[PDB]
């Protein structure tokens, strides 16, 4: 085919993709900064393409509606032919792998627990065995599906509580989870990926922290539509950037170099 | 149908000989994390299989002169095996010539010392000469050093590649033995998974020090273009999501720890 600008679907999720301070003065890809913005640039340079960052319209990662079977989110953008690639903290999962292609992971993570400092909770088991502290997850992403599908007793118990809790314990964006932890005087804990958690505990006012081990072990991948010829080069580029140390540099740059909570 | 030929490697606790194996036959000779994994993948994908220990006992590297692949990788490239189920690192050079599932385990390169050795990091190794150190032959750790442009790692490579006698070993067990027997004068660079397993084994004289040097994964490998790959990769993601991989890990690493809780 002719030369074409690659349409990249991504999500406003700190520190992956953020609005730059002076974004009102800026246009196109220059509006944004963060780990995935830098990662996009690196993949584009290796794979020899021009591209356009496009924030996903509905703000979601991607789930399939059980009634209509329509995919939302970034996954929907690839499934339905709107975008050419997803460069974002998109978890490689079974149900997504059936419908899109994924690179090998560019980051490793697991589900984890965020508390307001001081909350008397150290583990999933501790959340599951009490009722005073509410807890939930992001909508339309892999963490909620983790709970919904777990056969492990403690996780199952947690899903059973979460799915029926009133008011709703689920949040639309990670920022909304963070505010609910910060504002709830220790009466809400948030289940989110260790990568997001670790970032948030580096930001003022330093009132949150990760507790416990991770609940699972998995990875974020760069996604393309099933069968897209871009996949092979993009997967090699990931592995090369991993091997060169560039992914490690990017993680330190966006998580720790400008940390607001010490060390 | 047809029996799937699985290449693997004798590497504790992934594949080990059972007690009394000399009277056993076939797949029943072996036990460990990758034996259990192979069984799970075969069940999910609907195939019979035969485990076969790689003839040359290597993971796989390409000879710079001949461009021939050895090890498990060579098995798959030259058509001797249909799948590899082993702690085989997903790497750029390998990805060019075989297919890989998404990772079934996460790991990084790490440092093993005999307890009390005055080393706490790679940097520490690189700044002295009393304590020798090396890696496995024919694997991803050795390639990591050979190819690194990071100063500390490049410096390590320069030393290792020229050190006399050789600091490289043929098997992980040999590297561990060398650590154990060298009175603190040998440290070994190996994957955090293996390091963690050995520090749970008697005589409890080794330990992992410092952070991991990198972050990567093991995958199930198949020859490039094999029709097994799709189903295998989905099976790894299912076993992951069902918590089976975590259960296998706990069974083979920690259940049997001999060096405390
Ligand atoms: N990374 C997740 C979103 C965050 C979460 O669900 O905790 C996904 O790809 O769905
Ligand atoms: N997992 C490695 C072998 C161990 C090592 O090199 O430390 C490989 O696939 O080459
Ligand atoms: Na796919
Ligand atoms: Na073999
Ligand atoms: Na180390
Ligand atoms: Na499950
Ligand atoms: Na688990």
Coordinates of C-alpha atoms and ligand atoms in Angstrom, one line a residue:
Chain A
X1 CA 0.0 0.0 0.0
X2 CA 0.9 3.7 0.0
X3 CA 2.6 5.3 3.0
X4 CA 0.1 5.8 5.7
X5 CA 0.1 7.4 9.2
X6 CA -0.5 4.8 11.8
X7 CA -3.4 5.5 14.1
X8 CA -2.4 4.7 17.7
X9 CA -5.2 4.2 20.2
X10 CA -4.1 5.0 23.8
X11 CA -5.6 6.1 27.1
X12 CA -5.1 9.0 29.5
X13 CA -3.5 7.0 32.4
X14 CA -0.7 8.5 34.4
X15 CA 2.3 8.2 33.9
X16 CA 1.7 6.4 30.7
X17 CA 0.0 9.2 28.8
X18 CA -0.6 12.6 30.4
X19 CA -1.5 16.0 29.2
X20 CA 1.7 18.2 29.0
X21 CA 1.5 21.4 31.3
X22 CA 1.1 23.7 28.3
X23 CA -1.0 21.3 26.2
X24 CA -3.5 24.2 25.4
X25 CA -0.6 25.8 23.3
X26 CA 0.4 22.4 21.6
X27 CA -1.0 20.3 18.8
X28 CA -1.1 16.6 17.8
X29 CA 1.3 14.3 19.5
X30 CA 3.0 17.2 21.2
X31 CA 0.1 17.5 23.6
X32 CA 1.1 14.4 25.5
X33 CA 3.9 13.0 27.5
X34 CA 4.7 9.9 29.5
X35 CA 6.1 6.3 29.3
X36 CA 3.8 5.2 26.4
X37 CA 4.4 8.4 24.5
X38 CA 8.1 7.8 24.7
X39 CA 7.5 4.1 23.9
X40 CA 5.4 5.0 20.8
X41 CA 8.2 7.2 19.5
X42 CA 10.8 4.4 20.0
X43 CA 8.6 1.7 18.3
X44 CA 7.8 4.1 15.4
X45 CA 11.5 4.9 14.9
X46 CA 12.5 1.2 14.8
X47 CA 9.6 0.1 12.7
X48 CA 9.9 3.2 10.3
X49 CA 6.4 4.7 10.5
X50 CA 4.6 8.0 11.2
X51 CA 1.8 8.0 13.7
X52 CA -1.0 9.8 15.4
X53 CA -1.8 9.4 19.0
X54 CA -5.6 9.2 19.6
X55 CA -7.1 9.0 23.1
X56 CA -9.8 6.3 23.2
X57 CA -13.2 7.9 23.0
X58 CA -14.8 6.1 25.8
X59 CA -11.9 6.1 28.2
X60 CA -11.9 2.3 28.6
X61 CA -9.3 -0.5 28.3
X62 CA -11.7 -3.0 26.7
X63 CA -14.3 -5.5 27.7
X64 CA -16.9 -7.5 25.7
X65 CA -20.6 -6.8 26.7
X66 CA -22.2 -10.1 27.8
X67 CA -25.5 -9.3 26.2
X68 CA -24.4 -7.6 22.9
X69 CA -21.0 -9.1 22.6
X70 CA -19.6 -5.7 21.4
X71 CA -16.0 -4.8 22.5
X72 CA -15.5 -1.3 24.0
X73 CA -12.3 0.6 24.8
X74 CA -9.0 0.3 23.0
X75 CA -9.7 -3.3 22.2
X76 CA -12.9 -2.2 20.4
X77 CA -10.9 0.4 18.4
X78 CA -8.6 -2.4 17.1
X79 CA -11.4 -5.0 16.7
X80 CA -13.7 -2.7 14.7
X81 CA -11.0 -1.2 12.5
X82 CA -10.5 2.3 13.8
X83 CA -7.0 2.1 15.0
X84 CA -3.9 0.4 13.7
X85 CA -2.1 -0.2 17.0
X86 CA -2.7 0.2 20.8
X87 CA 0.3 1.5 22.8
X88 CA -0.9 1.7 26.3
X89 CA -0.9 -0.3 29.6
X90 CA -3.1 -2.9 28.0
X91 CA -3.0 -6.3 29.9
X92 CA -2.4 -9.4 27.7
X93 CA -5.4 -11.7 28.6
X94 CA -7.0 -14.8 27.1
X95 CA -10.2 -13.2 25.9
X96 CA -8.3 -10.4 24.2
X97 CA -5.7 -12.6 22.7
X98 CA -8.5 -14.5 20.9
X99 CA -9.5 -11.2 19.1
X100 CA -6.3 -9.1 18.7
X101 CA -2.6 -9.7 18.4
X102 CA -0.2 -8.8 21.2
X103 CA 3.5 -8.2 21.3
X104 CA 5.5 -9.9 24.0
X105 CA 5.2 -7.9 27.2
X106 CA 6.9 -4.5 27.6
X107 CA 6.2 -4.4 31.3
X108 CA 5.5 -7.0 34.0
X109 CA 2.9 -6.5 36.8
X110 CA 0.3 -8.0 39.0
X111 CA -2.9 -6.9 40.7
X112 CA -2.2 -5.3 44.0
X113 CA -3.9 -3.5 47.0
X114 CA -3.8 0.3 47.5
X115 CA -4.7 1.6 50.9
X116 CA -4.9 5.0 52.6
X117 CA -1.8 5.0 55.0
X118 CA -2.8 3.5 58.2
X119 CA -5.6 1.3 57.1
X120 CA -5.5 -2.0 59.0
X121 CA -5.2 -4.2 55.9
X122 CA -2.1 -6.1 54.7
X123 CA -3.5 -8.6 52.2
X124 CA -6.4 -9.9 50.2
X125 CA -7.1 -12.3 52.9
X126 CA -7.5 -9.5 55.4
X127 CA -9.9 -7.6 53.0
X128 CA -12.0 -10.8 52.5
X129 CA -12.5 -11.5 56.2
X130 CA -14.0 -8.1 57.2
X131 CA -16.8 -5.8 56.2
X132 CA -15.9 -2.3 57.5
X133 CA -13.6 -1.5 54.6
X134 CA -15.1 -1.5 51.2
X135 CA -13.0 -2.3 48.2
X136 CA -13.3 -2.4 44.4
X137 CA -11.7 -2.3 41.0
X138 CA -11.7 -0.4 37.6
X139 CA -14.6 -1.1 35.2
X140 CA -14.0 -2.6 31.7
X141 CA -10.5 -3.9 32.4
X142 CA -8.6 -7.0 33.3
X143 CA -8.7 -6.6 37.1
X144 CA -12.4 -6.8 37.3
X145 CA -12.5 -9.9 35.0
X146 CA -9.8 -11.5 37.3
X147 CA -12.2 -11.4 40.2
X148 CA -15.1 -12.4 38.2
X149 CA -13.4 -15.5 36.9
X150 CA -11.2 -16.6 39.8
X151 CA -11.7 -20.1 41.3
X152 CA -9.4 -19.3 44.2
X153 CA -11.5 -19.2 47.3
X154 CA -10.3 -15.8 48.7
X155 CA -10.7 -14.0 45.3
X156 CA -14.0 -15.6 44.8
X157 CA -15.1 -14.4 48.1
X158 CA -14.0 -10.9 47.3
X159 CA -15.8 -11.0 43.9
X160 CA -18.9 -12.2 45.6
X161 CA -18.8 -9.1 47.9
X162 CA -17.8 -6.7 45.2
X163 CA -20.4 -7.6 42.6
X164 CA -23.2 -7.0 45.0
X165 CA -21.8 -4.1 47.2
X166 CA -24.0 -1.0 47.6
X167 CA -23.1 1.6 46.8
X168 CA -21.0 0.4 43.8
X169 CA -17.4 -0.2 44.5
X170 CA -16.3 -0.1 41.0
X171 CA -14.8 3.0 39.4
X172 CA -14.6 4.3 35.8
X173 CA -11.0 5.6 35.9
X174 CA -8.0 4.9 38.0
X175 CA -8.1 8.5 39.2
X176 CA -11.6 8.0 40.6
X177 CA -10.3 5.0 42.6
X178 CA -7.4 7.0 43.9
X179 CA -9.8 9.8 45.1
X180 CA -12.1 7.3 46.7
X181 CA -9.1 5.8 48.7
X182 CA -7.9 9.3 49.6
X183 CA -11.2 10.7 50.7
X184 CA -12.7 7.7 52.5
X185 CA -10.8 7.9 55.8
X186 CA -9.5 4.3 55.5
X187 CA -12.9 2.8 54.6
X188 CA -12.1 2.1 51.0
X189 CA -9.3 0.1 49.5
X190 CA -8.6 -0.1 45.7
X191 CA -7.5 -3.1 43.8
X192 CA -5.3 -2.1 40.8
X193 CA -2.2 -3.0 38.9
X194 CA 1.1 -2.8 40.8
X195 CA 2.5 -0.5 38.1
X196 CA -0.3 2.1 38.7
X197 CA 0.0 1.6 42.5
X198 CA 3.7 2.1 42.6
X199 CA 3.3 5.3 40.6
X200 CA 0.6 6.8 42.7
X201 CA 2.5 6.2 46.0
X202 CA 5.3 8.3 44.5
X203 CA 2.9 11.4 44.1
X204 CA 1.8 14.0 46.6
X205 CA 0.3 14.1 49.1
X206 CA 2.0 10.6 49.7
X207 CA -1.1 9.3 51.5
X208 CA -1.4 6.0 49.7
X209 CA 0.6 2.9 49.6
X210 CA 0.8 -0.6 48.1
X211 CA 0.4 -3.4 50.7
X212 CA 0.8 -7.2 50.3
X213 CA 2.2 -9.3 47.5
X214 CA 0.8 -9.1 44.0
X215 CA -2.3 -11.4 43.4
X216 CA -1.1 -12.6 39.9
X217 CA 1.7 -12.2 37.4
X218 CA 1.2 -10.9 33.9
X219 CA 2.2 -8.3 31.3
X220 CA 1.3 -5.4 29.1
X221 CA 1.6 -5.8 25.4
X222 CA 1.4 -3.6 22.3
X223 CA -1.7 -4.7 20.5
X224 CA -2.5 -4.8 16.8
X225 CA -5.6 -6.1 14.9
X226 CA -5.5 -9.9 14.4
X227 CA -3.3 -10.6 11.5
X228 CA -1.9 -7.1 10.9
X229 CA 1.5 -7.2 9.2
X230 CA 2.7 -4.5 11.6
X231 CA 2.8 -7.1 14.5
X232 CA 6.0 -8.8 13.7
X233 CA 8.2 -5.7 13.5
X234 CA 6.5 -4.2 16.6
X235 CA 7.2 -7.4 18.6
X236 CA 10.8 -7.4 17.6
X237 CA 11.1 -3.7 18.5
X238 CA 9.8 -4.5 22.0
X239 CA 12.3 -7.2 22.5
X240 CA 15.1 -5.1 21.2
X241 CA 14.2 -2.1 23.5
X242 CA 13.9 -4.6 26.4
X243 CA 17.3 -6.0 25.7
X244 CA 18.9 -2.6 25.3
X245 CA 17.7 -1.5 28.7
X246 CA 15.5 1.2 27.2
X247 CA 12.3 0.0 28.9
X248 CA 14.0 0.0 32.3
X249 CA 15.3 3.6 31.7
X250 CA 11.7 4.7 30.7
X251 CA 10.2 3.1 33.9
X252 CA 12.8 4.9 36.2
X253 CA 12.1 8.2 34.3
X254 CA 8.4 8.2 34.7
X255 CA 8.0 6.4 38.0
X256 CA 10.9 7.5 40.3
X257 CA 13.2 10.2 39.0
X258 CA 10.6 13.0 39.9
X259 CA 9.0 11.1 42.9
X260 CA 7.5 13.4 45.4
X261 CA 7.6 11.1 48.5
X262 CA 11.3 10.7 49.1
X263 CA 14.2 8.3 48.3
Chain B
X1 CA -3.3 -38.4 15.2
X2 CA 0.4 -38.1 16.1
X3 CA 2.6 -37.8 19.2
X4 CA 4.1 -34.4 19.9
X5 CA 7.9 -34.5 20.5
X6 CA 8.6 -32.2 23.5
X7 CA 12.2 -31.1 23.8
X8 CA 13.2 -30.1 27.4
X9 CA 16.2 -29.9 29.7
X10 CA 17.3 -31.5 33.0
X11 CA 17.2 -28.3 35.1
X12 CA 15.9 -28.4 38.7
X13 CA 13.0 -28.0 39.6
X14 CA 11.7 -27.7 36.1
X15 CA 12.6 -31.3 35.0
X16 CA 14.2 -33.8 37.3
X17 CA 14.7 -37.5 37.3
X18 CA 12.3 -39.3 39.7
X19 CA 13.6 -41.4 42.4
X20 CA 13.9 -44.9 41.0
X21 CA 13.8 -43.7 37.5
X22 CA 16.0 -46.4 36.2
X23 CA 13.1 -48.7 36.3
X24 CA 10.6 -46.3 34.8
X25 CA 10.0 -45.5 31.2
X26 CA 8.8 -42.7 28.9
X27 CA 7.4 -39.6 30.4
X28 CA 7.1 -41.3 33.8
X29 CA 10.9 -41.0 34.3
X30 CA 10.6 -37.2 35.0
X31 CA 8.9 -34.8 37.4
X32 CA 9.0 -31.1 38.0
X33 CA 7.4 -27.8 37.1
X34 CA 7.8 -28.2 33.2
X35 CA 6.7 -31.9 33.4
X36 CA 3.4 -30.7 35.1
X37 CA 3.2 -27.8 32.7
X38 CA 3.6 -30.1 29.7
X39 CA 0.8 -32.3 31.0
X40 CA -1.5 -29.3 31.3
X41 CA -0.7 -27.9 27.9
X42 CA -1.2 -31.3 26.3
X43 CA -4.6 -31.7 28.0
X44 CA -5.8 -28.3 27.0
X45 CA -4.6 -28.7 23.4
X46 CA -5.7 -32.3 23.0
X47 CA -2.4 -34.0 22.1
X48 CA -0.3 -36.9 23.2
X49 CA 3.4 -36.2 23.7
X50 CA 6.8 -37.7 24.4
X51 CA 9.3 -35.8 26.6
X52 CA 12.8 -35.9 25.3
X53 CA 15.9 -34.4 27.0
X54 CA 17.9 -32.3 24.7
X55 CA 20.8 -34.3 23.4
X56 CA 23.5 -31.7 24.0
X57 CA 22.1 -30.4 27.3
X58 CA 22.0 -26.8 26.1
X59 CA 19.3 -24.1 25.8
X60 CA 20.4 -22.7 22.5
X61 CA 22.8 -20.3 20.9
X62 CA 23.9 -19.8 17.3
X63 CA 27.5 -20.3 16.4
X64 CA 29.1 -17.1 15.1
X65 CA 31.2 -19.0 12.6
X66 CA 28.9 -21.7 11.3
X67 CA 25.5 -20.0 12.1
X68 CA 24.2 -23.4 13.4
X69 CA 21.8 -23.4 16.4
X70 CA 22.5 -25.8 19.3
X71 CA 20.4 -26.8 22.2
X72 CA 16.6 -26.8 22.4
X73 CA 16.4 -24.0 19.9
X74 CA 18.4 -26.2 17.4
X75 CA 16.0 -29.0 18.0
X76 CA 13.1 -26.9 16.9
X77 CA 14.9 -25.1 14.1
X78 CA 16.1 -28.4 12.5
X79 CA 12.9 -30.3 12.9
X80 CA 13.9 -32.7 15.7
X81 CA 11.2 -31.5 18.1
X82 CA 7.7 -30.1 17.8
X83 CA 7.6 -28.0 20.9
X84 CA 10.0 -26.9 23.7
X85 CA 8.6 -26.9 27.3
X86 CA 11.4 -25.6 29.4
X87 CA 12.7 -22.4 31.1
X88 CA 13.6 -21.0 27.7
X89 CA 14.1 -17.3 27.7
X90 CA 12.2 -15.3 25.1
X91 CA 14.9 -13.2 23.3
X92 CA 15.2 -11.2 20.1
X93 CA 17.6 -13.5 18.3
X94 CA 15.5 -16.6 19.2
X95 CA 12.2 -14.8 18.3
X96 CA 13.6 -14.3 14.8
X97 CA 13.9 -18.1 14.2
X98 CA 11.2 -19.8 16.4
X99 CA 7.8 -18.9 17.7
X100 CA 7.1 -18.2 21.5
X101 CA 4.0 -18.2 23.6
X102 CA 3.5 -15.3 25.9
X103 CA 5.6 -15.9 29.1
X104 CA 4.6 -18.5 31.6
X105 CA 7.0 -17.2 34.2
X106 CA 8.8 -13.8 34.8
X107 CA 12.4 -13.5 35.7
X108 CA 15.6 -11.6 35.6
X109 CA 19.3 -12.2 35.6
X110 CA 20.6 -12.2 39.2
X111 CA 23.7 -12.8 41.3
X112 CA 24.4 -16.0 43.4
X113 CA 27.1 -15.9 46.1
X114 CA 28.3 -18.2 48.8
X115 CA 26.9 -16.7 52.0
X116 CA 29.2 -14.0 53.4
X117 CA 30.9 -13.1 50.1
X118 CA 31.5 -9.3 50.2
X119 CA 29.4 -8.6 47.0
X120 CA 26.0 -6.9 46.9
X121 CA 25.7 -5.9 43.3
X122 CA 26.9 -6.3 39.8
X123 CA 28.8 -3.1 40.2
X124 CA 30.6 -4.7 43.1
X125 CA 31.7 -7.6 41.0
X126 CA 32.9 -5.3 38.2
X127 CA 35.1 -3.2 40.6
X128 CA 37.2 -6.0 41.9
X129 CA 39.3 -9.0 40.8
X130 CA 39.6 -11.4 43.8
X131 CA 36.2 -13.0 43.2
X132 CA 35.7 -14.7 39.8
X133 CA 32.3 -14.9 38.2
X134 CA 30.6 -16.4 35.2
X135 CA 27.5 -17.6 33.5
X136 CA 26.0 -20.6 31.8
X137 CA 27.2 -21.6 28.3
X138 CA 24.9 -21.4 25.3
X139 CA 22.2 -19.4 27.0
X140 CA 20.5 -16.0 27.3
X141 CA 22.6 -14.7 30.3
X142 CA 25.8 -15.1 28.4
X143 CA 24.3 -13.4 25.4
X144 CA 23.1 -10.6 27.7
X145 CA 26.6 -9.8 28.7
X146 CA 28.1 -10.2 25.3
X147 CA 25.7 -7.7 23.9
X148 CA 25.3 -5.1 26.7
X149 CA 26.3 -1.6 26.1
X150 CA 25.7 -0.7 29.8
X151 CA 29.1 0.2 31.3
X152 CA 29.1 -2.1 34.3
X153 CA 27.8 -5.1 32.2
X154 CA 30.3 -4.4 29.4
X155 CA 33.1 -4.3 31.9
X156 CA 31.9 -7.7 33.3
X157 CA 31.8 -9.2 29.9
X158 CA 35.3 -8.1 29.1
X159 CA 36.6 -9.8 32.1
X160 CA 34.5 -13.0 31.8
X161 CA 35.2 -13.6 28.1
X162 CA 39.0 -13.5 28.8
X163 CA 39.1 -15.0 32.3
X164 CA 41.4 -18.1 32.7
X165 CA 40.5 -20.8 33.6
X166 CA 37.1 -20.5 32.1
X167 CA 34.4 -19.0 34.2
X168 CA 31.6 -20.4 32.2
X169 CA 29.9 -23.6 33.1
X170 CA 28.0 -26.2 31.1
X171 CA 25.0 -26.6 33.5
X172 CA 23.4 -24.6 36.2
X173 CA 24.2 -27.4 38.7
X174 CA 27.9 -27.0 37.8
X175 CA 27.8 -23.2 38.4
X176 CA 26.1 -23.8 41.8
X177 CA 28.7 -26.4 42.7
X178 CA 31.4 -24.0 41.8
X179 CA 30.0 -21.3 44.0
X180 CA 29.6 -23.8 46.9
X181 CA 33.1 -25.2 46.6
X182 CA 35.1 -22.1 45.8
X183 CA 35.2 -20.6 49.4
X184 CA 33.6 -17.3 48.3
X185 CA 36.0 -16.8 45.3
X186 CA 33.3 -17.6 42.7
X187 CA 30.0 -15.9 42.1
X188 CA 27.5 -17.0 39.6
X189 CA 25.2 -15.0 37.2
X190 CA 21.9 -16.9 36.7
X191 CA 18.2 -16.3 36.4
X192 CA 16.4 -15.3 39.5
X193 CA 14.1 -18.4 39.2
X194 CA 16.9 -20.8 39.5
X195 CA 18.7 -18.7 42.2
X196 CA 15.6 -18.6 44.3
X197 CA 15.1 -22.4 44.0
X198 CA 18.8 -23.1 45.0
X199 CA 18.7 -20.8 48.0
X200 CA 15.7 -23.0 49.3
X201 CA 17.9 -26.2 49.1
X202 CA 20.3 -27.7 51.6
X203 CA 23.1 -27.0 52.5
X204 CA 21.5 -23.4 52.5
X205 CA 24.9 -21.9 51.7
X206 CA 24.0 -19.6 48.8
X207 CA 22.0 -16.5 48.5
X208 CA 20.7 -14.2 45.8
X209 CA 22.1 -10.6 46.1
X210 CA 21.1 -7.3 44.6
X211 CA 18.2 -6.5 42.3
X212 CA 17.6 -8.4 39.1
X213 CA 19.6 -7.0 36.1
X214 CA 16.8 -7.2 33.7
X215 CA 13.1 -8.2 33.3
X216 CA 12.0 -10.9 30.9
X217 CA 10.1 -14.2 30.5
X218 CA 10.1 -17.8 29.6
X219 CA 8.0 -19.0 26.8
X220 CA 6.8 -22.2 25.3
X221 CA 8.6 -22.4 21.9
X222 CA 7.5 -24.0 18.6
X223 CA 9.1 -24.1 15.2
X224 CA 8.3 -20.9 13.2
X225 CA 4.8 -21.2 11.7
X226 CA 3.8 -24.4 13.5
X227 CA 0.0 -24.7 13.8
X228 CA 0.5 -25.7 17.5
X229 CA 1.5 -22.2 18.5
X230 CA -2.0 -20.6 18.6
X231 CA -3.5 -23.2 20.9
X232 CA -0.4 -23.4 23.1
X233 CA -0.3 -19.7 23.6
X234 CA -4.0 -19.6 24.6
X235 CA -3.4 -22.6 27.0
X236 CA -0.6 -20.7 28.7
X237 CA -2.8 -17.7 29.1
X238 CA -5.7 -19.9 30.5
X239 CA -3.3 -21.7 33.0
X240 CA -2.0 -18.3 34.0
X241 CA -5.4 -16.8 34.6
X242 CA -6.8 -19.9 36.4
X243 CA -3.9 -19.6 38.9
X244 CA -2.4 -22.9 37.8
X245 CA 1.0 -21.6 37.0
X246 CA 1.1 -20.0 40.5
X247 CA 0.2 -23.2 42.1
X248 CA 2.9 -25.1 40.1
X249 CA 5.4 -22.5 41.2
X250 CA 4.5 -22.9 44.8
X251 CA 4.6 -26.6 44.6
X252 CA 8.1 -26.8 43.1
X253 CA 9.8 -23.9 44.8
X254 CA 8.5 -23.4 48.2
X255 CA 6.6 -26.5 49.3
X256 CA 9.8 -28.3 49.7
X257 CA 11.9 -25.4 51.0
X258 CA 14.7 -26.9 53.1
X259 CA 16.1 -23.6 54.5
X260 CA 13.1 -22.2 56.6
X261 CA 9.8 -20.3 56.0
Ligands
LIG1 N1 -4.4 -2.8 32.3 C1 -5.8 -3.1 32.5 C2 -6.5 -1.8 33.1 C3 -6.3 -1.6 34.6 C4 -7.0 -2.6 35.5 O1 -8.0 -3.3 35.1 O2 -6.7 -2.7 36.7 C5 -6.5 -3.6 31.3 O3 -5.7 -3.7 30.3 O4 -7.7 -3.9 31.3
LIG2 N1 16.9 -19.5 30.4 C1 18.2 -19.4 29.8 C2 19.2 -20.4 30.4 C3 19.7 -19.9 31.7 C4 20.7 -18.8 31.6 O1 21.2 -18.5 30.5 O2 21.0 -18.3 32.7 C5 18.1 -19.6 28.3 O3 16.9 -19.8 27.8 O4 19.0 -19.5 27.6
LIG3 NA1 -3.9 -13.3 18.3
LIG4 NA1 15.1 -33.1 22.7
LIG5 NA1 21.9 -8.8 41.2
LIG6 NA1 -9.6 -17.8 36.2
LIG7 NA1 -2.8 -16.3 41.6

